[PDB]
Design a protein around this ligand. Structure first.
Ligand SMILES: [Mg+2]
Length: 248
């Protein structure tokens, strides 16, 4: 096996039992005063240095994980928007880490963009580490949703009035466009943050998904993944399944 596959397997296995939060970053369709704001209406490339660097990282992750044996026919607009969202999601995570004075190297994280049968594009984030505890989950979801809604309104490519921008900002927050995994519960009852096990969830679940290679995307497929160790980023689908196999 390649050093890359062996390296990824070992990195995940070392973290098999690390407790982490599970978030999903998403968006929902919005119509404001006749103006349609769809899942891919956020294609401004903002000239902030860190954001640009992050988007370049997403592009190269896509490029290196592309299997060229076969052909890929994913829409250009779709790829572009996913690259932009990868940069925005990570910007949000890093902004909250800054708030907590958490050194990025003390954090384990994993990001995976997917296409759901019903909801379409969304992005799973697993994140945790020594500076993280379960009771902080609700706060993390709220802070992340603040930055996510803020960045989405800045990246929106639909011409909006100030009133419409504010409406969009409050929709993204009120409707929780960042979700946090909790234990199952009744509506009026308490919800408890449900941490997951980092390495196991990646190897036994996220790495089992099928690669999106077409437009429209295959339901339940993944676009792009990355992690805090740059371990899974460049893996082709076949290599990801090998990682799962070796991990067991
Ligand atoms: Mg999913």
């Amino acid at each position: 096996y390649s050093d890359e596959v062996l390296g990824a397997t070992n990195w995940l296995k070392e973290k098999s039992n690390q407790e982490v939060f599970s978030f999903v970053f998403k968006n929902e369709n919005v119509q404001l005063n006749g103006k349609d704001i769809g899942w891919n209406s956020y294609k401004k490339e903002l000239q902030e240095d860190e954001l640009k660097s992050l988007q370049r990282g997403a592009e190269t992750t896509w490029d290196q994980s592309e299997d060229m044996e076969w052909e890929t026919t994913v829409d250009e607009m779709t790829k572009k928007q996913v690259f932009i969202f990868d940069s925005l999601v990570k910007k949000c995570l890093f902004e909250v880490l800054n708030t907590k004075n958490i050194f990025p190297g003390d954090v384990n994280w994993f990001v995976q963009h997917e296409w759901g049968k019903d909801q379409g594009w969304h992005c799973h984030v697993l994140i945790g580490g020594k500076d993280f505890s379960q009771a902080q989950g609700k706060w993390w979801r709220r802070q992340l949703n603040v930055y996510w809604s803020r960045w989405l309104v800045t990246a929106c490519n639909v011409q909006l009035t100030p009133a419409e921008r504010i409406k969009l900002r409050e929709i993204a927050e009120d409707n929780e466009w960042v979700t946090l995994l909790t234990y199952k519960h009744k509506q009026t009852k308490k919800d408890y943050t449900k941490c997951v096990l980092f390495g196991n969830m990646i190897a036994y679940y996220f790495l089992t998904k099928k690669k999106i290679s077409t437009s429209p995307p295959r339901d339940g497929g993944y676009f792009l993944s990355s992690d805090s160790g740059w371990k899974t980023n460049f893996l082709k689908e076949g290599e990801r399944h090998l990682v799962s196999k070796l991990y067991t």
